[PDB]
Curated annotation (Swiss-Prot), chains A, B, C, D:
The keyword Acetylation does not apply. Ca(2+) binds at residues 123, 125, 127, 132. Belongs to the leguminous lectin family. GO terms for molecular function: carbohydrate binding; metal ion binding. Keywords: Calcium, Lectin, Manganese, Metal-binding, Signal. Binds one manganese (or another transition metal) ion and one calcium ion. The metal ions are essential for the saccharide-binding and cell-agglutinating activities. This is Galactose-binding lectin. Homotetramer. The chain holds residues 24 to 255 of 273 of the full protein. Transmembrane segments: none annotated.
Length: 232, 232, 232, 232
């Protein structure tokens, strides 16, 4: 039983348990603001500093993990509410794509929307070049922002959104449950073999981005995580 | 968007929001004691009073729900810890089987261990006649306590256990993440078409049962639930 | 090396190992409820029946001890939490102060908040008459609930708290580590010359109290204890 | 409220949370054997891979931590049982001192027995050059294997030893509670300003050394830890 577990009710600069990339910033109240409102094509990513072993090439086993986080997106006069936030898993050498154009790539893909990652996005701007549905949505991404699956969702400015994710290694199922301000929940699940798409050791994080005309406040308020690899 | 959501940090006799059945009692702190230790073959169930609609015959849609609860199981001199607790879903008229023999039936099945229900069991006693794994386990039960699927588990006497469940209607997947006292998680997932195994309107709840030589303390400490059915 | 060591994972009236004083009552799950919610200025105390020799006048040696225990405090409409629990050490003949007014005396002191004891209080209601801090707090008490030193704490209703106390006779240091539900730890330590404040033989126990308007549920879930006295 | 917490009931090579230094080896049963029996001056160290911030220069606050771990030492024919284990805290860049001669340096000090670290040793070999007591002992080391304080102890071969450490930030007290196989406890405590002796970011870990004629099996059976730094 190999278990990595952490809980964040707030954040602060200096904590060695978390890595910042790009235009990330910690607010006095302890929240993480992922993008910068004055930069064009902004990109902000926050990662748990320590890599986590999600599978052993020895036991062949794959870990299960339970994580939940709360975020908030808020409009600002008078740019378009873009582009959203993404909870991702990637190789430990994961950096903000070079020459990132931000926007629809969400800071995890190249200009074509390709990359090495597995994630859950909370997309609030429609990008046709990536085949986005016409409305706000939640999608499961596997090496591309061209979601492997999506579900209609509604991003309510200033609302605090609570998310719960469960990965069952046995069925290799990734289930997501989103709790909107109104109390309604949105779910989405997709079978993804983490052992076949990611390396033994990976990192977990949040990413968000904007464009020239599209910018909003992307806030990460809290994050608790727990993985458990069976060794034997 | 039809949603049902409730949250109990503690219970109490009376509250018409929860129908009791059997040897159920309420401790001083609001904890529910599903069974009685001075009674042979005891059964006790607790149900959310108001029935819930998990699917529509018109729309065809099945509801998605997110539920979490924390229970505790403690041993008693010198008796055997059995059998345990089951989170279940059944027809709005559900009742403790006629002539319930308690024990392995968990208060939801008959002698053969069959019944009209869906649920997750935290089985602590192994009944070979029900093809029970040799050790403590967690199982996805569909109309039978002879689990559709099980996973090795460890029940620790006196430890507060936390459970989170997510049912994604899009995939008909039922995900379970069990957080143990020591922080390790156990998961199990199973595709279960509720729409096919249950009526449009059901009731959610907990059930536990002891036998003659097998009795233990089963307590429910909290329960929050949210189901959402799309009506469009 | 004289060693006294015991473990209590569940309690049960009748056990000659425990002395019950006041309004104490054992729940059916094995928990000890210290206060009566239907009584004004209630007081309850549970004590290890066998007096423990912490020091000897013959050698001048003082014993070191290690002890851990878990409690649970929960609210009750619309009353105010009062007043909390206190782990205390005292003369083997200790009884509840005659004419106990309940309140912030925790059942170990008189109206002026004075008594003959040493303990760790987990104060939830602030009493200006006892120089209490404005918020919930943990404190080291020496013959008075007018703590020799307190520390900011946060009592969370329905939450299981873990405490570990270490007394080093060589330094006469009493150390307390409090594990909250969220995983945060709270500590407080202080030099207390036991040999100079209590008789050679004393009793160890917990006590809780409520008042007229302030009442809550105080539960002791477990308790393990080990002291070693050097004889040479 | 910043908090780091991990828990190991067993260990396995490959876990990125653990850093191995020296002759460290993981046994088939999940234990960590710190030294190499066929090697002269064998030195083995295991550290928690993630640096911990024990104090911020911003607020000037020191963290509090509660740790506990079980270890075991076993004699090997007919070599002398040496030298023991040390639980230490050093700079995040800490490495086995070049030209480490092992033995009484315990793998954290130079020839003179000096280095940059704070720790608790379980010394089973008297080294007059470092002023060790004539017998097995436990000591609080502050930048030197010439303990600032010791207490008589007794290493029993094959015996599992359970230790619990508490470091209260308010008093800057480091308290240790050692529970021997037979059930007797040994405590030692010392005031130590971790903010005056170490940098803001450090690493925790265990070290073990041997000599030419002094060798034995040093095992770390399990380790749990929780630090909490109040950033407010
Ligand atoms: Ca997009
Ligand atoms: Ca069974
Ligand atoms: Ca008070
Ligand atoms: Ca030595
Ligand atoms: Mn998209
Ligand atoms: Mn079963
Ligand atoms: Mn007080
Ligand atoms: Mn020494």
């Amino acid at each position: 039983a190999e278990t990595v577990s952490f809980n964040f009710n707030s954040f602060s600069e200096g904590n060695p348990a978390i890595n910042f990339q790009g235009d990330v910033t910690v607010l006095s109240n302890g929240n993480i603001q992922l993008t910068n409102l004055n930069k064009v094509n902004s990109v902000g990513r926050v990662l748990y500093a320590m890599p986590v072993r999600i599978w052993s090439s020895a036991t062949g086993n794959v870990a299960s993990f339970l994580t939940s986080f709360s975020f908030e997106m808020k409009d600002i006069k008078d740019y378009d509410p873009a582009d959203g936030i993404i909870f991702f898993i990637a190789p430990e050498d994961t950096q903000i794509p070079a020459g990132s154009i931000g926007g629809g790539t969400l800071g995890v893909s190249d200009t074509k929307g390709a990359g090495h990652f597995v994630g859950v996005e909370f997309d609030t701007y429609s990008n046709s070049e990536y085949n986005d549905p016409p409305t706000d949505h939640v999608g499961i991404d596997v090496n591309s922002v061209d979601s492997v699956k999506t579900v209609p969702w509604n991003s309510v400015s200033g609302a605090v959104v609570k998310v719960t994710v469960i990965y069952d290694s046995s069925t290799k199922t990734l289930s997501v449950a989103v709790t909107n301000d109104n109390g309604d929940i949105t779910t989405i699940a997709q079978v993804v073999d983490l052992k076949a798409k990611l390396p033994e050791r990976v990192k977990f994080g949040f990413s968000a981005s904007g464009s020239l005309g599209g910018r909003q406040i992307h806030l990460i308020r809290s994050w608790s995580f727990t993985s458990t690899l069976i060794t034997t």
